[PDB]
Fold Phosphoribosylaminoimidazole-succinocarboxamide synthase.
Amino acid sequence: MRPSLSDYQHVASGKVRELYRVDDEHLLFVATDRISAFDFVLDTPIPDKGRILTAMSVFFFGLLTVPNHLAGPPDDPRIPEEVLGRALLVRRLDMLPVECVARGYLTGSGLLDYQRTGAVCGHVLPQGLGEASRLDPPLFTPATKADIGEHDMNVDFAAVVGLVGAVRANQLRDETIKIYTRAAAHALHKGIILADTKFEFGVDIEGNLVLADEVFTPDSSRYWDAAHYQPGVVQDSFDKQFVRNWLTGPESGWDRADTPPPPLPDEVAVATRERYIEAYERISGLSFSDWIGP
Ligand SMILES: C[C@H](c1ccccc1)n1cc(-c2ncnc(N)c2C#N)cn1
């Protein structure tokens, strides 16, 4: 008999994720079916999105050789039936207060910072770059969390040193770039560009650095279709472009310029679920039909 979710203490909520205390040394990391676009959590959930993204994360943890916070199998008996397939039992860590971001391509706030200053997070870049320019080598572009409705603020390496220590900052930088490089190469081999990615790390009792969040999901990372990669224009979101196009199209009745957006057409939600499955199966070489669920 699996426990009820109500047996555990809710300790944190994100836009589309939840965190629960299981015991003194373990948490339950829960992905929901909610989806965010234009910094709004949309009214309409995407069926199986939580399960698909959990499957993705589990695959990438297995691909990487670095210590991670997984503390049991996807069907661990401590996982409630209600969240089976979209929840992971993890080890409690002392989390480091740094959003560890790697960018292989220049877009979003990285692009904006570059267009404003010529630099991103302390990195002075060549002149002449633009939207979706390839960065080589990938950049460590750390950020810190701000207030509830605010975007993370980009910071430089010295800021990271000030947050975690000089040696630890080096370690975060090196591991972030190494992990991103490995996963990006794997994905691209399968036809998907991982343009960038965001990690959080924590520290265990012995002082070891442990990867601890979700890793390389389309929420934590920009997924692009490599077959349509065209530098100089904004790349379609592999998973969210249908959602984006409808919301800003002639059928939504919504002006993006910060009214809460309307619910999505069922057809758009279903199409979106399909894109998540496509991305998962291509990258993992596995079938989502095999992934556990209620
Ligand atoms: C910000 C992020 C979060 C995730 C899910 C929902 C809301 C927030 N978070 C992660 C921890 C955390 N703390 C201790 N040990 C861990 N292994 C983890 C993890 N993962 C605390 N917060």
Notes: The pocket of Q0Q is lined by residues 12-14, 17-19, 27, 29, 69, 90-93, 95, 202, 212-213 (CB under 6 Å). Helices lie at 49-63, 108-117, 157-164, 166-189, 241-247, 266-284.
